[PDB]
Design a protein around this ligand. Sequence first.
Ligand SMILES: *[C@@H]1O[C@H](CO)[C@@H](O[C@@H]2O[C@H](CO)[C@@H](O[C@@H]3O[C@H](CO[C@H]4O[C@H](CO)[C@@H](O)[C@H](O)[C@@H]4O)[C@@H](O)[C@H](O[C@H]4O[C@H](CO)[C@@H](O)[C@H](O)[C@@H]4O)[C@@H]3O)[C@H](O)[C@H]2NC(C)=O)[C@H](O)[C@H]1NC(C)=O
Ligand SMILES: *[C@@H]1O[C@H](CO)[C@@H](O)[C@H](O)[C@H]1NC(C)=O
Ligand SMILES: *[C@@H]1O[C@H](CO)[C@@H](O)[C@H](O)[C@H]1NC(C)=O
Ligand SMILES: *[C@@H]1O[C@H](CO)[C@@H](O)[C@H](O)[C@H]1NC(C)=O
Ligand SMILES: C[As](C)(=O)[O-]
Ligand SMILES: [Ca+2]
Ligand SMILES: [Ca+2]
Ligand SMILES: [Ca+2]
Ligand SMILES: [Ca+2]
Ligand SMILES: [Ca+2]
Ligand SMILES: [Ca+2]
Ligand SMILES: [Mg+2]
Ligand SMILES: [Mg+2]
Lengths: 455, 457
Amino acid sequence: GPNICTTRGVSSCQQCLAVSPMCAWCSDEALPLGSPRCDLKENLLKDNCAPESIEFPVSEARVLEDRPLSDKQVTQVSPQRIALRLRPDDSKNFSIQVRQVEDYPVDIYYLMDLSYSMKDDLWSIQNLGTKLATQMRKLTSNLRIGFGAFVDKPVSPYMYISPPEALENPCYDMKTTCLPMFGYKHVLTLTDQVTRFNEEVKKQSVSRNRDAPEGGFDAIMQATVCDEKIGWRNDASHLLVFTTDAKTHIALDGRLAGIVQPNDGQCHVGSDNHYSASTTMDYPSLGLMTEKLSQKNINLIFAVTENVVNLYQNYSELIPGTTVGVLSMDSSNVLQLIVDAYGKIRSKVELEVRDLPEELSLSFNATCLNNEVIPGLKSCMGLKIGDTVSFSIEAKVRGCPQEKEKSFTIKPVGFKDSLIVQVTFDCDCACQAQAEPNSHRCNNGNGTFECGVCR
Amino acid sequence: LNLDPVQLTFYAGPNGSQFGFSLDFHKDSHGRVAIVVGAPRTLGPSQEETGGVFLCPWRAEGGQCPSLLFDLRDETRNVGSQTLQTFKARQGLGASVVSWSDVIVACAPWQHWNVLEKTEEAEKTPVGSCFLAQPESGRRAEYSPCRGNTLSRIYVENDFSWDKRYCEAGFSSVVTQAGELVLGAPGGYYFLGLLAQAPVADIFSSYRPGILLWHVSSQSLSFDSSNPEYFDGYWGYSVAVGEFDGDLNTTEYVVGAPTWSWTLGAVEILDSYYQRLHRLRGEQMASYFGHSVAVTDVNGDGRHDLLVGAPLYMESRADRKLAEVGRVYLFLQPRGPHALGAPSLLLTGTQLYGRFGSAIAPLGDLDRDGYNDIAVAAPYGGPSGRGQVLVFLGQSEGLRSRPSQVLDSPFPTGSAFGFSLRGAVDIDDNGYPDLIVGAYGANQVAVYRAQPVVKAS
Ligand SMILES: *[C@@H]1O[C@H](CO)[C@@H](O[C@@H]2O[C@H](CO)[C@@H](O[C@@H]3O[C@H](CO[C@H]4O[C@H](CO)[C@@H](O)[C@H](O)[C@@H]4O)[C@@H](O)[C@H](O[C@H]4O[C@H](CO)[C@@H](O)[C@H](O)[C@@H]4O)[C@@H]3O)[C@H](O)[C@H]2NC(C)=O)[C@H](O)[C@H]1NC(C)=O
Ligand SMILES: *[C@@H]1O[C@H](CO)[C@@H](O)[C@H](O)[C@H]1NC(C)=O
Ligand SMILES: *[C@@H]1O[C@H](CO)[C@@H](O)[C@H](O)[C@H]1NC(C)=O
Ligand SMILES: *[C@@H]1O[C@H](CO)[C@@H](O)[C@H](O)[C@H]1NC(C)=O
Ligand SMILES: C[As](C)(=O)[O-]
Ligand SMILES: [Ca+2]
Ligand SMILES: [Ca+2]
Ligand SMILES: [Ca+2]
Ligand SMILES: [Ca+2]
Ligand SMILES: [Ca+2]
Ligand SMILES: [Ca+2]
Ligand SMILES: [Mg+2]
Ligand SMILES: [Mg+2]
């Protein structure tokens, strides 16, 4: 019988709704004096209150924009817009679906061995360069590519230091011409301009040094740790493709050049796009490379010729996560490693709330790929392209805000799409519109009349 | 803690000189002990890096030392239609030092050399050189066995056979008890590596001031190979001597080739005619197995045992993750004519990037319990990464698995404390062998004295 609606002793329809979501009001004038006006709906109907005169607002969540999720404008979140009708202290729940439809962002940086042994290999690596651009373009439209070149530490006995003509033209004593020697050179920052990348790669030519092992590991280290120069994107997936036709210099080799300072793992490229510590700092060790590749989240791919394929496979075991392909005129093998790499890229749908009112508070139930409902979680992980996840959101309000019209946003991190939610607060009754102030029925025109009650 | 870590003696050289890059004990003639110290970036009167050697007498206080004077000027000399040239800029004099009897030998691995004939040349290249000094008499001599006068063109037609132009002779060095000087030349024969040997007596006697190119008659060089396993192997990156074939009349060489067979690394034991007796292969690629080599009898049976350092060895850990810590290998020599086998013991570093095994020094019998002991350097080891030297005591089974003492670096970061190590000599004449430690980064050398029991502090 009695309940919190009746015991409060409310004066108006408004106060009746403020007591609890379950309360309803009876405006019917034919209702007797003894009967309570503020009560549950069943009890009002039980006391012959007319259905027309019952004021019982109900909270609801109407979908406004509900475009379906895209296959293969783009819709990744659904629905997009929602109107929330809330009464005092009530809470209506609604649903939201997310799908990773768009292509993943991928960065490829290309390291070209440009020593004299690559002369006969130069076409292959130039072809591989431009074929990388093509293969990755048809996998993902969101691509940024770049490259740099290396030879070895420009210091004796790696470098020919005589005669004086040999410094500007290492190929002097062969009666031909090649470029001057350099350690590592950053040519083109990561950019979407693929046609410019293709032009630049085709312009490259070889230099010359003395010893078969080269300084590519200097290049790998600097390409890894020089974030701003290379231009890696925080969110993107990073591939570092490394080409050579010969064995490589490793830490402690540098003592043959008088270099004993261990590799400090820092960036030393800077203004002129040259590795300035090439002549003063030792080659990096396998471990230091692994640390930095892991730290900067970069995937190293060895694109080496067949005569050293076993060598770099062996190094690949000592640097986990590294793959190896055979560089040649045929580019199938190394491109497969790029395809494989993309097929491992996983993303996350992590919801974040923006411009949420002080009075509103949310709670979330997530349903990820395993299709299990986990309460109090608003993020799923391990999504491929096309995978769909689902969330159930409950919006609860504390009391009744007088701001009335507000709106907030629920946006996945990394996504451009979002669910806009317009909030309205229904704290009034339908009979409050037909209020007659200064009515002579209530105390000689001193009190207002609304919903069958004086004031 | 019988090596006193509180009462330390410090010697110091000039800033930037890399004083302490190499070192050895020196007994003049023949009682008092001194420390020879290499400083391979010391300036000459001209402000170019030629390197230098310092001869420190024993003083508890330590301090500055006198310079051991050497010829620092470039030489040019016309013989017939050829011009012979030496270039001492950045030559690294003191990159290695070794004392034998009353003679000190100090080498410049990166001394360059060239020969001009008309419009052609041999090419300017780091053949390297060693300088010999007899400090009391003031006598001087040189030995540069890789200098040639073959013109560039001839090597190209030879396909680069017998090409000693990039030797870096004296990269490493050792003198046998009989007084044969043995030089490591890692860049020899187009970077295969070679060894050059000659009697110190004959180097002094056959040297003639102002010649530049000469042949020491009793010298002996190792050989070129067409075996791809040796290519870019840096054979002679480190060198040592010992008895390994049970014939005390002959002496055997221990050579480190830390990039042998595609960076697998290897140590070889050869006779004095460079015919190899055994080869120890590396465990893991890029570990620089053979970076350092020590010889001593650690288990008291009267037969020399072998210690090999692999500073860049990566150790297995949880979640399939490798960790560069460095490792040292002990090989005990069995009785009879039998060959060496697998490692009897594996000592592994603890600190990441510490380079445990970078240097290995025989200490002699430190606690006089009848078993010789060793010291192992981890130049960037210890919790702080400032450097660390670990003392391992010998026993009948070989060596102890854990160190009896751990000397932490008293120098700041980047000192390279431990990069050079020498022991097995009683410097303060108290009957107990001492240890000296180089910290080339700080331009200093630390002397650690053994206390007259198995003491602590
Ligand atoms: C990249 O990394 C791989 C893996 O480590 C290296 O491949 C190994 O190379 C070593 C050295 O050549 C091989 O060891 C040698 O094997 C030869 C044949 O062994 C066969 O029979 C054994 C049965 O025990 C099989 O396991 C094996 O698969 C073969 O079918 C032997 O003839 C060799 O013995 C001779 O040399 C050794 C010294 O090494 C002496 O001790 C012996 O007395 C004898 O003279 C030797 O054991 C090894 O088999 C290879 N493993 C694999 C899986 O291929 C690559 O060399 C390396 N490449 C590069 C470029 O780095
Ligand atoms: C909210 O969750 C309830 C669970 O009782 C469910 O019945 C309802 O369908 C959900 N609301 C919407 C709008 O889907
Ligand atoms: C989440 O699940 C819990 C437990 O089943 C339930 O009490 C709650 O109503 C759910 N919320 C939504 C928004 O579905
Ligand atoms: C050594 O030289 C360096 C120059 O890089 C200088 O900064 C430093 O102060 C010098 N060290 C000492 C101990 O004076
Ligand atoms: C070591 As080369 C012949 O590629 O300059
Ligand atoms: Ca080639
Ligand atoms: Ca090279
Ligand atoms: Ca012998
Ligand atoms: Ca022994
Ligand atoms: Ca002992
Ligand atoms: Ca003593
Ligand atoms: Mg090359
Ligand atoms: Mg001696």
